[PDB]
Design a protein around this ligand. Structure first.
Ligand SMILES: O=c1ccn([C@@H]2O[C@H](COP(=O)(O)OP(=O)(O)O)[C@@H](O)[C@H]2O)c(=O)[nH]1
Ligand SMILES: [Mn+2]
Length: 351
């Protein structure tokens, strides 16, 4: 049994970029559950083999991490092209890890054919015909199915909480008590404005000391429908393996998601936040049935409620520590099901 994992549209090297980091974490968690796996990327490296040094058919399973296949600017993105060429040569079923609703599987050919550099690729080299099984992080599968309507080879849809890998890593540990320097914190990208309303609601004009880390920038928030006066402090990106430490600098950390994540996706940030020294505060709309934690104190409906909840936490260190103790206990209950999680993953990739 030999497994190959690749990122469909981003180079994989180290932990400097999110797509590279997530691919390496997945490689590591799969290796830790008893499996011979290789990451195949553009070049040979600490964690990877090169597309041109291996034969895709030497592998029995091909796992693909979702990614955008948009060609920005006027140049051939080799990370996208080489990955799809690799996929096109594979004979067996391809397992597509769907962790972001904006990144469903799709063919790059339709786009490539109309580029000025189209002469560099043939339809045969890029058109992927192998059957595809979408492994969705969404438990309802409704979004995954709708997102993959324009694809015919996708013959299967199965749910699996992929991003729980954060807590199942062999080197994982809960964050320790940290000196507080912020009231509220949130880390992430602008996500092409797909979450602007929620970001403005909970992180702007709060009167609190809030930090927004990640690729997002203040100048990106300009939608007239979601006005604001005072923005949080944007500090820039940091490595994915430093996120829990960053979250721990605040009294509370926010959990929000795209509309379609609601009552469906339990994202990586849920675990990165729950494991941190910051109290996890969740937008009620994101998890209306309170599947993450059965304690309403961890949920807020709007800006006003967030402010009040944070004020309560700043006023009582006892309450803050009580809530942290509860969320850490809940996280431990899921960690206790590691073996079941691993077996479920193996079942998902037909092992
Ligand atoms: O500076 C940063 C900010 C965020 N992240 C990662 O980016 C994820 C958030 O991704 P996104 O902004 O797409 O939000 P999601 O839709 O996953 O909530 C976090 O969970 C972190 O793992 C990171 O590595 N560095
Ligand atoms: Mn995500």
């Amino acid at each position: 049994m030999k497994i190959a994992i690749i990122n469909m549209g981003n180079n994989v090297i180290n932990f400097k970029t999110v797509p590279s980091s997530e691919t390496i974490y997945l490689f590591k968690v799969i290796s830790e559950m008893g499996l011979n796996v290789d990451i195949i990327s553009l070049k040979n490296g600490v964690y990877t083999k090169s597309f041109d040094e291996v034969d895709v058919n030497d592998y029995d399973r091909l796992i693909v991490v979702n990614s955008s296949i948009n060609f920005f600017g006027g140049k051939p993105n080799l990370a996208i092209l080489s990955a799809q060429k690799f996929m096109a040569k594979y004979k067996s079923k391809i397992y597509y890890l769907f962790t972001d609703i904006r990144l469903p599987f799709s063919q790059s050919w339709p786009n490539v054919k109309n580029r000025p550099w189209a002469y560099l690729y043939t339809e045969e080299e890029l058109l992927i015909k192998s059957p595809i099984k979408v492994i969705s992080q969404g438990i309802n599968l409704d979004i995954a199915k709708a997102a993959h309507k324009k694809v015919d080879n996708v013959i299967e849809f199965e749910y699996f909480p992929i991003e729980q890998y954060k807590i199942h890593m062999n080197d994982f540990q809960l964050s320790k008590p940290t000196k507080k320097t912020l009231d509220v914190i949130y880390g992430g990208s602008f996500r092409s404005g797909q979450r602007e309303s929620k970001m403005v609601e909970f992180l702007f004009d709060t009167g609190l000391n809030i930090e927004f880390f990640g690729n997002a920038r203040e100048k990106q928030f300009k939608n007239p429908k979601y006005p604001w006066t005072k923005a949080p402090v944007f500090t820039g990106k940091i490595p994915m393996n430093m996120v829990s430490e960053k979250n721990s600098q605040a009294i509370a950390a926010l959990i929000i998601g795209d509309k379609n994540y609601n009552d469906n996706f339990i994202t990586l940030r849920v675990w990165e936040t729950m494991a941190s020294d910051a109290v996890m505060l969740i937008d009620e709309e994101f998890d209306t049935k309170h599947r993450i934690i059965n304690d309403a104190r961890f949920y807020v409906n709007n800006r006003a409620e967030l402010i009040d909840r944070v004020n309560e936490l700043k006023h009582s260190d006892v309450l803050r520590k009580e809530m942290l103790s509860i969320q850490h206990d809940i996280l431990n209950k899921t960690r206790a099901k590691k073996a079941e999680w691993q077996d479920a993953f193996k079942k998902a990739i037909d092992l």
